């Protein structure tokens, strides 16, 4: 009744209007375990960025290579092994130096998956329903690549094409 | 509710609402037939004939879990006898 | 035998899972 | 003299020493704890319960890297039989050049490994130093997200409710069908995928595990229903462990007995083993109700569980409430049982070695025993005390009555005085009779007529060996006749194995019995009697008795009432626990030593010696203690020292320690107050040392402090002894 | 400092009062028994716990009753 | 799981807006003084007194590095290994096949020079009304100010001056352990390669 | 060996020395306890405990032959158990 994406079920009582993506998609009723929305909503954001930067990466690194050998190998998984750990290692510590200060952030602030992150001012002078529009186009993009990488991962390590 | 029970029998919500409402009419004979089977079942995949890798027969074995059944059927049957069912 | 590489780095490992108990010591307070 | 004990403004008041002592032992009983609320109870239990168990990962962790690191793990793989395996290395300022030299194994020197972690590993399919060194990164990783976990659920917005806590339903459906079915669903995939190959000489790693095929059909049969031909081709009785010499295809068969190589179970045996538990947990987990309508509400079936004649009373009505709003029920109905789990580990880990090599490492068999052995009885010890803390703290007598009549639990505290009686009866009638008969034949084998002794033959116990299979006592009864339906049922499924290892000599597998077995038996029985004893009375006895029918107002551990009425020592329900503590140590003792005894005669090949000696006290003093005593008291002599030194010193630290702990326990305070004073004034009336005063004034330990701390050096001294005992006896009597 | 409770079991026999060291318990006039006395606590701050008021006690289960809690220079018997 | 609550209501987060703004290391600062006092008031941890300290031991490290390089291409540094019978069994590292390897004499020396200095610093630590700057914070004292990305270019023998050094020394080490590891050389080795050659000659 | 399972044939060795034993802890608790419920009612039975009345004693004593017949006339006419003059506990 309530939920857009199961028009027969009712959505949990904490699935309602605010926090854009909203489709009382919660049949498990795992929101009614948590004591607010905040820090699953940050937690499916931050999924839904690093998806879309691996749904990239993946396509990317199988058409485009950088100049060195280290990085010429086209299988993504295999590329997770031929590529030295110093690189790796960089990338792990790059991460983490991000995510201690969020850590600090977002178990505490009222939208944690807001992290300040705008230089190039793309949501400056935008309207609250335009910002609304925005957050559901991330959203809906990022749980699209969420699915889209998890294939990708799974019918390389099943058959070892990366693509197609 | 109040499953607690001093009198002769426990009252029929004791058997969940799907056996609250079978007739012991029902109840018994089925519980009975249940019993029959499963020792059947157990006997012939025991007993009778020596249990062997290439004979395990589901049918025998999801028959013999009647019997663990059929105590709790009949139990049912006496609990809407007594309580006028 | 096991090279310098790996047991420095599970003493790098050790030292994160040290910092993580006196987080939760700290936390269970005084 | 302030801030230590900041859960406590009572003991930081404390002027002496004994805000110290108390601050110690006072830091877990939260519920005791100043400005304390249960909301704050059960989340400070549940981060540390999750810091324990970062804990006993990281310890597993530790393990792991030093086998990796100083071990000799790959040696003994390729020779199981003869290499010793090395549990770390040592590096002692203290040691002489001798000491080096004789602990000196290969490199360095080192302790021998008595945890059996080499069979362990080794049977699960681990060879190498770099799958040891995995293992440990792995649970280093495991332990930093407990760690993390238990930071994050003391955080605001993830600190759970009570709700959620007493939320009965849910844990016990997740406990059971995740915890348990699912643990043994993922350790039957690790078992088949990995140890199994790996036992036929294929190696699958976190490489090829995804294109090895466990079985050559490959989830065909499972599918299909042809469950049979995971059966088929089972390893043979050539086959040699790790290799592919005379193995087979099969991953879950029927075998019973052991493997003809390693004197272990199967491999596939216990594959099957754990899918079938784990079918089976999976399915109970689906018993309790959640949110979709179906399942069972366990306070409807504890409150409909009443006789209708009526000899229980109510029945269980009012069980739900009392073990929901209490932690001490819980955790006493935990602890015994893990004390029953962890004595079935200790009783069949000896009698059906489930790992490779591991029943030909006899140190390692006994020490294994020992501890698990010594853990169950200090687990039982503990479930007893903490029912009497219930009874003490949590037990309310409105919520386990109805209308007058009382419930199952009420009515224990009604014939209490019946159930204390009657203990008491089966104590003193073991007890005369036990030592009656095995004094009549001290006396008598002393005199020289030894055909005169009162040997019993344990038919009873033979009487099951033989309904398992066992032809050696001539009954004919269940298993050992070929015509019994018990027989002719599994003659095609596990008989063959099962018949094959229980009527060998070699094993462990029910080990012959004889008059000793009989009276060893009623001894630990004895034992076990007089240790339940003590706990029920100081359980039941917890609330109040006729000396003091206000005990509960003084809580559970109080030193006493005073000396009046006659005197009131060791009155409280914690005294009971302090005094059945040392019958578990003896109960725990008299087993080890049979166990021990028996062992080490059948190791030897003497086995005479004990069907004879065993029947009288002195035959065991003489026999095993005497005897076997020799090898490890010569660790070090005038002469020289041996790789056994080290047991040697812990023998007489052991020795040490169990009687400081006699001082703790015969001395008892008032008599170590005064001494003090008179330190005091000496300090306070010496030049050069004015100049130096305490904060805290020295003081006595307390009453109920100097009872724990005798039994804690009884305790340890106790242990150590026994350790260093049979370790240092095994190893130098056997090689 | 202990804790020193006195019930109305109390007869007035004064055997607590004058066995107390510390001079912790003291009669005070009643009318719950034939004496017209009963005896109180009003110096709690003394008590050491020698639990001698409550041997000298002749009711069934006592009148006074002793319950320790927490410790000081005073309750401990501490000449230092 | 639906017929309660799991956290209670009285139980939530509060954003905390005392750190508004407050780049990450006046909130990492903040956070860690807020959350271990007794420590950062001692100037324990990331304190602008431990910073400097620390900075100083880096500085005089690369000293000590520069000096070990040198001595060890000069013939100095003492050849062999470590008497067993006159310094006990402690100084045994392994035993391959009848031969004990010990302790390097080298080694041994250069722990006693680091011995030396490690003693003066102790001294100095328990010395503190005594000397120009104590090792850590008095009850009251408060911590000298964070210098920011880029401290105050003053130069000479000047607060700001060693500050910078400090830092840049610390950065060395660290890129200079970072260098060793991924590529596999001698810390020597790593040193050598930085100065083209003339440390090792 | 003995074998005491039960059985008739080796039944000298534990069974009629069972018999023999229970008897005669049968006999010494019947004459105690009749001992003790007849001084029980005296004036001063407590006296009658250190000092012996050594008439009554005797007549007591030789009269626990009878002991399983004496029980199991004494359990039938409800003499042998209390039923609630026992005292108990406060919990
Ligand atoms: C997002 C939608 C999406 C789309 C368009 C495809 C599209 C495709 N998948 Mg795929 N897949 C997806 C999600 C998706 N998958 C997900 C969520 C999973 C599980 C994690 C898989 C698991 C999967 C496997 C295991 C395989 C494919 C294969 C294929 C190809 C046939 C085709 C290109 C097959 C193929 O050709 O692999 C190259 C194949 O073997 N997929
Ligand atoms: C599938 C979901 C799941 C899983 C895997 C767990 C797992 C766990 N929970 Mg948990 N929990 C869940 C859901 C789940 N929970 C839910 C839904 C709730 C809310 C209702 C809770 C509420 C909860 C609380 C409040 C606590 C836990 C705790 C724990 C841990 C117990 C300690 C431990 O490591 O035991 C490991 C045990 C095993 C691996 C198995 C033990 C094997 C036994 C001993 C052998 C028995 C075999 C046999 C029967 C022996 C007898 C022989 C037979 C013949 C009779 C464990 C990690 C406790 C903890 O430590 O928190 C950190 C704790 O305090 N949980
Ligand atoms: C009248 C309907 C009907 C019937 C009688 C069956 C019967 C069967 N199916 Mg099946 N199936 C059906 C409808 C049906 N299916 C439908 C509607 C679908 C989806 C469109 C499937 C999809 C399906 C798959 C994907 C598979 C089967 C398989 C099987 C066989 C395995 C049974 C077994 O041993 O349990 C096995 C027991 C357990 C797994 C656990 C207990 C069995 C003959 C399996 C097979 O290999 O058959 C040869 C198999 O892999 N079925
Ligand atoms: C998982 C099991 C478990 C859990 C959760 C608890 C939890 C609790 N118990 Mg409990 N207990 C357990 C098992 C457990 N116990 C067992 C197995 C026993 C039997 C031995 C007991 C016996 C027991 C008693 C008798 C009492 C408790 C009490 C308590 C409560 C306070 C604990 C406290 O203050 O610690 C204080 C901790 C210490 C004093 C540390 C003692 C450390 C010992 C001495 C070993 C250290 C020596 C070490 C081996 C050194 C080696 C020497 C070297 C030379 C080799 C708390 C609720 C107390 C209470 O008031 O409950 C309400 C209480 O009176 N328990
Ligand atoms: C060798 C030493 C020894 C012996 C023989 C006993 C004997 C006994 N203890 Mg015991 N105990 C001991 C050491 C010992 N204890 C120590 C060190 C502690 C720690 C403080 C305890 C703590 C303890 C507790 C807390 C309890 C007992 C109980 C008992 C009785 C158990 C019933 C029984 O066996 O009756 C048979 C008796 C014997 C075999 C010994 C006496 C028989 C002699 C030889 C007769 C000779 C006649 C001439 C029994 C009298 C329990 C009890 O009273 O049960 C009723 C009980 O509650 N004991
Ligand atoms: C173990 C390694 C080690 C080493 C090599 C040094 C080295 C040094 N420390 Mg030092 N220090 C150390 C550990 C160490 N410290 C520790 C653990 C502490 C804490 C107690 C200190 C506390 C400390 C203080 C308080 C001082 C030093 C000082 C010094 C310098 C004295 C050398 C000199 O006189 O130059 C010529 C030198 C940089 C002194 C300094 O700054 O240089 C003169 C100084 O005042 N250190
Ligand atoms: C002679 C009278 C007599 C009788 C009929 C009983 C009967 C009983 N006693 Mg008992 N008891 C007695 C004397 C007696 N006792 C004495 C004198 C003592 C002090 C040592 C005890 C100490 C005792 C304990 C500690 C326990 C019992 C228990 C029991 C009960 C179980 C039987 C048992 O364990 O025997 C126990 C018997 C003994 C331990 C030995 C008794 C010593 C001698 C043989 C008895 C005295 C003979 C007497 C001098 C004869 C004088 C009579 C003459 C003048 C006419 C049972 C109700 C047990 C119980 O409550 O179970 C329900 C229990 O735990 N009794
Ligand atoms: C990358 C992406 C968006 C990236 C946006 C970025 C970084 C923007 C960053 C900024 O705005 C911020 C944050 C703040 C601004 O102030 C600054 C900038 C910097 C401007 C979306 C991808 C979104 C990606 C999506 C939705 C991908 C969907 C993929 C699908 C459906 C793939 C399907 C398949 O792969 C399978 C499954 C199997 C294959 O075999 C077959 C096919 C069909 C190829
Ligand atoms: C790089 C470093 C620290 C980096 C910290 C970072 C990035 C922190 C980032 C964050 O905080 C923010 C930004 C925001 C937070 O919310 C989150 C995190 C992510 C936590 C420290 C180096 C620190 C490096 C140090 C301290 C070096 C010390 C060297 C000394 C003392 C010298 C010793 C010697 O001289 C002797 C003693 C003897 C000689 O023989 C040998 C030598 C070694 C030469
Ligand atoms: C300051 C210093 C040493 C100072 C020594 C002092 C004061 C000694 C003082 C003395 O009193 C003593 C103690 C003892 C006396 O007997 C001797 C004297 C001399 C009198 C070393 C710094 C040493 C500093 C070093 C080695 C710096 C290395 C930096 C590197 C490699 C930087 C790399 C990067 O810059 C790139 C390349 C690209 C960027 O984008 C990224 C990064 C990574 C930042
Ligand atoms: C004090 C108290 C408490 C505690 C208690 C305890 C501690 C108990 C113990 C208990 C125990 C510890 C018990 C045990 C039991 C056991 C059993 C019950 C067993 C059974 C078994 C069986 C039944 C078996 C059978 C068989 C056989 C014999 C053969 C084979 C097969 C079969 C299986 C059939 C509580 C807390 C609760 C509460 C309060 C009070
Ligand atoms: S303890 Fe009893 S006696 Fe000693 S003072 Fe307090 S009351 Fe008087």
Redesign the interface.
Same mark, same amino acid.
């Given at each position: 009744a309530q939920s857009k994406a199961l028009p027969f079920l009712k959505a949990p009582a904490k699935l309602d209007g605010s926090l854009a993506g909203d489709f009382g998609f919660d049949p498990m009723g795992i929101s009614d375990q948590v004591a607010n929305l905040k820090y699953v909503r940050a937690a499916e954001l931050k999924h839904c960025r690093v998806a879309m930067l691996g749904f990239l990466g993946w396509v990317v690194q199988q058409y485009v290579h950088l100049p060195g050998e280290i990085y010429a190998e086209s299988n993504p998984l295999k590329a997770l092994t031929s590529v030295p750990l110093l690189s790796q290692i960089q990338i792990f510590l790059f991460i983490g130096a991000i995510e201690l200060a969020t850590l600090d952030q977002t178990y505490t602030a009222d939208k944690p998956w807001d992290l300040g992150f705008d230089p190039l001012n793309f949501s400056k002078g935008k309207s609250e329903q335009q910002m609304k529009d925005l957050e559901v186009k991330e959203l809906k993009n990022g749980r699209v690549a969420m699915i889209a990488i998890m294939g990708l991962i799974a019918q390389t390590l099943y058959t070892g094409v990366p693509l197609f | 509710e109040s499953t607690y029970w001093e009198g002769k029998a426990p009252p029929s919500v004791v058997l969940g609402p799907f056996l609250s409402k079978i007739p012991s009419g029902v109840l018994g004979p089925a519980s009975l037939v249940a019993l029959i089977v499963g020792s059947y079942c157990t006997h012939e995949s025991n007993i009778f004939n020596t249990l062997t890798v290439d004979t395990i027969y589901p049918a025998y074995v999801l028959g013999s879990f009647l019997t663990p059944i059929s105590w709790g059927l009949h139990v049912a049957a006496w609990i809407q006898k007594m309580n006028k069912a | 035998?096991?090279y310098d590489?790996? !047991?420095?780095i599970?003493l790098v490992? /050790?030292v !994160? /899972?040290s910092v =993580?108990?006196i987080? =939760?010591? /700290?936390?269970?307070?005084? | 003299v302030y801030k230590f004990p900041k859960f406590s403004k009572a003991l930081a008041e404390d002027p002496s020493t004994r805000r110290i002592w108390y601050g110690i032992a006072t830091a877990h009983d939260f519920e005791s704890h100043d400005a304390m609320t249960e909301s704050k109870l059960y989340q400070k239990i549940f981060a540390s319960h999750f810091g324990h168990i970062a804990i006993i990962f990281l310890w597993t962790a530790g393990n792991l890297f030093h086998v990796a690191w100083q071990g000799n793990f790959e040696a003994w793989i390729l020779n199981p039989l003869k290499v010793r395996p090395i549990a770390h290395a040592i590096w002692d300022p203290h040691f002489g050049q001798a000491a080096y030299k004789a602990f000196l194994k290969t490199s360095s020197p080192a302790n021998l490994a008595l945890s059996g972690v080499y069979e362990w590993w080794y049977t699960i399919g681990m060879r190498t130093n770099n799958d040891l060194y995995q293992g440990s990164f792995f649970l280093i990783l495991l332990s930093s997200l407990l760690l993390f976990a238990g930071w994050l659920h003391l955080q605001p917005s993830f600190r759970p409710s009570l709700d959620w806590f007493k939320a009965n339903e849910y844990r016990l459906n997740h406990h059971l069908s995740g915890l348990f079915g699912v643990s043994s669903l993922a350790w039957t995939g690790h078992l088949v995928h990995v140890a199994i190959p790996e036992s036929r000489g294929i190696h699958v790693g976190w490489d090829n595990f995804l294109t090895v095929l466990p079985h050559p059909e490959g989830l065909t049969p499972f599918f299909s229903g042809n469950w049979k031909a995971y059966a088929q081709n089972p390893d043979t009785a050539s086959h040699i462990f790790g290799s592919g010499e005379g193995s087979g295809t099969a991953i879950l068969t029927f075998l019973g007995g052991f493997h003809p190589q390693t004197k272990s179970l199967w491999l596939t045996d216990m594959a099957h083993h754990h899918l079938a538990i784990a079918v089976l947990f999976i399915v109970a987990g689906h018993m309790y109700r959640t949110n979709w309508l179906i399942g069972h509400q366990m306070k409807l079936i504890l409150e409909a569980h009443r006789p209708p004649g009526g000899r229980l009373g109510i029945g269980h009505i009012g069980l739900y409430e009392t073990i929901t709003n209490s932690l001490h029920f819980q955790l006493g109905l935990a602890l015994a049982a893990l004390g029953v789990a962890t004595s079935l580990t200790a009783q069949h880990m000896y009698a059906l070695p489930p790992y490779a090599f591991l029943a030909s490492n006899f140190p390692t068999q006994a020490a294994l025993y020992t501890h698990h052995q010594y853990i169950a009885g200090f687990l039982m010890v503990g479930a007893f005390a903490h029912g009497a803390i219930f009874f003490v703290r949590d037990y309310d007598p409105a919520v386990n009555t109805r209308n007058g009549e009382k419930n199952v639990l009420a009515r224990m505290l009604e014939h209490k005085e019946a159930i204390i009686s009657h203990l008491s009866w089966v104590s003193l009638f073991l007890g005369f009779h036990t030592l009656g008969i095995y004094v009549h034949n001290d006396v008598v084998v002393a005199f020289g007529q030894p055909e005169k002794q009162i040997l019993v033959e344990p038919l009873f116990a033979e009487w099951i060996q033989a309904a398992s299979g066992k032809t050696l006592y001539n009954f004919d009864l269940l298993l050992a006749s070929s015509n019994s339906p018990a027989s002719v049922a599994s003659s095609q499924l596990w008989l063959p194995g099962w018949l094959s290892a229980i009527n060998d000599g070699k094993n462990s597998l029910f080990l012959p019995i004889g008059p000793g077995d009989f009276l060893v038996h009623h001894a630990i029985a004895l034992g076990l009697h007089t240790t339940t004893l003590i706990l029920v009375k100081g359980a039941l006895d917890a609330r109040g008795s006729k000396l003091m029918p206000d005990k509960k107002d003084f809580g559970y551990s109080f030193p006493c009432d005073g000396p009046g009425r006659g005197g009131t020592c060791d009155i409280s329900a914690w005294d009971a626990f302090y005094l059945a503590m040392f019958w578990m140590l003896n109960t725990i003792g008299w087993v080890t030593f049979y166990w021990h005894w028996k062992h080490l005669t059948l190791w030897q090949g003497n086995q005479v010696q004990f069907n004879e000696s065993s029947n009288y006290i002195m035959g065991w003093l003489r026999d095993y203690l005497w005897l076997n005593s020799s090898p490890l008291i010569n660790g070090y002599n005038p002469f020289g020292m041996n790789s056994l030194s080290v047991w040697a010193w812990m023998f007489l630290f052991g020795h040490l320690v169990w009687a400081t702990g006699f001082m703790f326990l015969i001395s008892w305070r008032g008599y170590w107050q005064e001494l003090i004073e008179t330190i005091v004034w000496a300090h306070e009336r010496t030049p050069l040392a004015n100049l130096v005063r305490w904060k805290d004034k020295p003081v006595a330990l307390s009453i109920v402090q100097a009872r724990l701390v005798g039994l804690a050096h009884f305790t340890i001294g106790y242990v150590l002894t026994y350790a260093a005992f049979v370790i240092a006896s095994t190893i130098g009597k056997l090689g | 400092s202990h804790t020193v409770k006195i019930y109305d079991t109390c007869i007035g026999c004064t055997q607590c009062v004058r066995a107390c060291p510390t001079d912790v318990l003291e009669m005070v006039p009643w009318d719950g028994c034939k004496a017209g006395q009963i005896a109180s606590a009003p110096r709690t701050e003394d008590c050491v716990g020698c639990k001698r008021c409550e041997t000298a006690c002749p009711t069934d289960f006592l009148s006074v009753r002793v319950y320790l809690g927490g410790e000081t220079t005073r309750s401990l018997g501490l000449a230092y | 799981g639906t017929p309660f609550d799991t956290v209670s209501k009285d139980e939530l987060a509060v954003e905390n807006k005392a750190m508004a703004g407050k780049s990450v290391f006046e909130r990492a600062m903040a956070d860690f003084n807020g959350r271990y006092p007794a420590v950062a008031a001692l100037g324990l941890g990331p304190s602008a007194k431990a910073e400097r300290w620390n900075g100083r031991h880096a500085m005089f490290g690369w000293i000590v590095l520069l000096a070990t390089g040198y001595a060890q291409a000069h013939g100095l540094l003492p050849e062999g290994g470590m008497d067993a019978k006159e310094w006990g069994t402690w100084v045994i590292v392994s035993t391959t096949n009848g031969e004990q390897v010990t302790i390097p004499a080298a080694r041994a020396a250069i722990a006693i020079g680091h011995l030396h200095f490690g003693a003066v610093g102790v001294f100095a630590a328990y010395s503190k009304n005594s000397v120009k700057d104590r090792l850590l914070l008095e009850p009251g004292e408060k911590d000298e100010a964070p210098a920011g990305l880029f401290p105050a270019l003053r130069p000479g023998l000047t607060k700001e001056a060693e500050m910078l050094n400090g830092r840049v020394a610390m950065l060395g080490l660290v890129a200079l352990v970072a260098v060793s590891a991924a590529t596999g050389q001698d810390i020597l080795s790593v040193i050598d390669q930085g100065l083209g050659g003339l440390l090792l000659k | 060996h003995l074998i005491t399972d039960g059985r008739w044939s080796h039944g000298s060795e534990f069974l009629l020395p069972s018999i023999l034993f229970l008897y005669i802890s049968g006999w010494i608790g019947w004459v105690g306890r009749k001992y003790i419920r007849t001084v029980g009612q005296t004036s001063n039975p407590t006296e009658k405990e250190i000092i012996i009345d050594v008439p009554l004693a005797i007549s007591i004593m030789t009269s626990g032959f009878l002991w399983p017949f004496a029980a199991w006339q004494e359990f039938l006419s409800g003499d042998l158990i209390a039923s609630d003059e026992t005292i108990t506990t406060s919990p």
């Open positions: - | - | 035998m096991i590489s790996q !047991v420095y599970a490992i /050790a !994160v /899972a =993580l108990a987080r =939760l010591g /700290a936390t269970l307070y005084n | - | - | - | -």
